[PDB]
Amino acid sequence: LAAALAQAL
Ligand SMILES: *C(=O)c1ccc(-c2ccc(C(=O)OCC)cn2)nc1
Ligand SMILES: *NNC(=O)c1ccc(-c2ccc(C(N)=O)cn2)nc1
Ligand SMILES: CCc1ccccc1
Ligand SMILES: Cc1ccccc1C
């Protein structure tokens, strides 16, 4: 999940 969101940055 972290990566799925972190892709924004
Ligand atoms: C949410 O973005 C997210 C993505 C990927 C993972 C995750 C956890 C563990 C592995 C892995 O290969 O573990 C082997 C011990 C890969 N991806 N978690 C959360
Ligand atoms: N929000 N995105 C990031 O912080 C981020 C974007 C892209 C990458 C990344 C990592 C590794 C490669 C590669 N060719 O090995 C390319 N892009 N990391 C973080
Ligand atoms: C694509 C997720 C990510 C974001 C920032 C740094 C590394 C990786
Ligand atoms: C590992 C991680 C966690 C939360 C936001 C961004 C990144 C790259």
- Pull the structure tokens for residue 6: 């972190």
Find tokens 């940055």 and name the residue.
9
Query: How far is residue 3's CA from residue 1's CA, in Å, rounded to a whole number?
Result: 5
Amino acid letter, residue 5: L
Rounded to whole angstroms, how far apart are CA atoms 9 and 1? Answer: 14
Dig out the tokens for 3 from the structure.
């990566």
Distance 4 CA to ligand 1 centre (A): 10
Structure tokens at 7: 């892709």
Smallest CA separation from ligand 2 atom 18, residue: 7
Buried b (16+ CB within 10 A) or exposed e, 1-9: eeeeeeeee
Tokens 């892709």 found at: 7
- The response to whether residue 4 sits with its C-beta less than 6 Å from ligand 1 reads yes
Resolution of the structure in the document, Å: 1.0
